[PDB]
Structures are given as C-alpha cells and as structure tokens.
Design a protein around this nucleic acid. Structure first.
Ligand code: MG
Length: 152
DNA sequence: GCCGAACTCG
DNA sequence: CGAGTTCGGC
C-alpha cells in the first residue's frame, strides 16, 4: 500500500488501553525498528526477537512508559500483525501451532516465529529520513491529548 | 519467566 | 465477542 495508508495505520495501531491510558508497546516497537534502520543495524527486512531489538525497545519504551506499563516486548512483536504490514516468518513445523498461539512470553515467540518482517514497500519507505519523521509524528496520534505531558 | 486468569476496550 | 494488555502462583 501507499505512504498515505501507512501514515493512517501508524496513527491507529489499536494499542491496549485502560482508563484513558494507552499501553505504549506497539508504538515503542515501531519506533525501535525505525531507530535500528536509522542506525544501520537493520539492513535487511529481517527483525529477530533478539537482544538488539529488546534493548532498542526498552530505550523507547522507558521514554514513554508510565508506572503501570510493563516491559514486555513479546506482546507487540506478535500483536503488531493485526496492522497488516507486520508479518511473521513462522518456524518450520510450527504453522498449525502458530494459528492458536498466544504471545505469553519469549519462549512462545521463539517456538513459533523465526523473525518478523515488514511489507517490502514499508521497509523501503522507512529507509527514508523524511518518511521516518512523518511516521514518527503519526505514531504520536495513538496517545490521548490528556496523557501527552507524560507520554509523547 | 512461565501461562491460565483477569481485566478493559471497542 | 476477540484483542491486547497485566496479574499472580508457580
Ligand atoms: Mg483494554
């Protein structure tokens, strides 16, 4: 799809919410992926559930988190697939388990998913500084006006 | 850190 | 009703 449609989807990731507060996991993971691209740490469209992703997620997650949020990178790593541009390369022999899997922890991710990957169009677009700046602003639209002071 | 259970969103 | 979170006993 087009840059317009990605901008729209990055603005509406359907994050978990509770009493007005938005779980920032899906935002922090997309920001971490864009960070990795920017730094040249993610040259191929192949996003492993590894220390490098977890550290980049934690850096962004800590910037956004409230006291109630828990550093659980396995959750957006799985649940971002409802966005339509975030996909899972499923491990050999795991195709049927994957269908009813839950992202209950790291071993559940590692059993089922070899790595995550993007739409090829999105991956190419994110090579572009202007696109990353655009989609970064789009991600902030997931957060309510009332929490912007603590979560932006 | 695991996952069944609980919770809230919509 | 399912999605996407946190909780709690282990
Ligand atoms: Mg909720």
């Amino acid at each position: 799809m087009s840059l317009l449609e990605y901008e729209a989807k990055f603005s509406e990731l359907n994050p978990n919410r509770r009493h007005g507060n938005t779980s920032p996991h899906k935002i922090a993971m997309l920001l971490a992926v864009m960070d990795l691209i920017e730094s040249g740490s993610l040259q191929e469209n192949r996003i492993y559930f590894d220390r490098q992703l977890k550290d980049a997620f934690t850096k962004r997650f800590n910037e956004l988190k409230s006291e109630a949020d828990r550093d659980n990178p396995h959750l957006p790593y799985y649940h971002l697939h409802t966005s339509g541009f975030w996909h899972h390369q499923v491990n050999p022999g795991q195709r049927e388990s994957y269908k009813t899997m839950s992202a209950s922890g790291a071993s559940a991710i590692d059993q089922h998913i070899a790595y995550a990957y993007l739409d090829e169009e999105l991956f190419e677009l994110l090579q572009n500084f202007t696109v990353r700046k655009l989609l970064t602003s789009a991600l902030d639209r997931n957060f309510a006006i009332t929490e912007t002071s603590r979560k932006s």
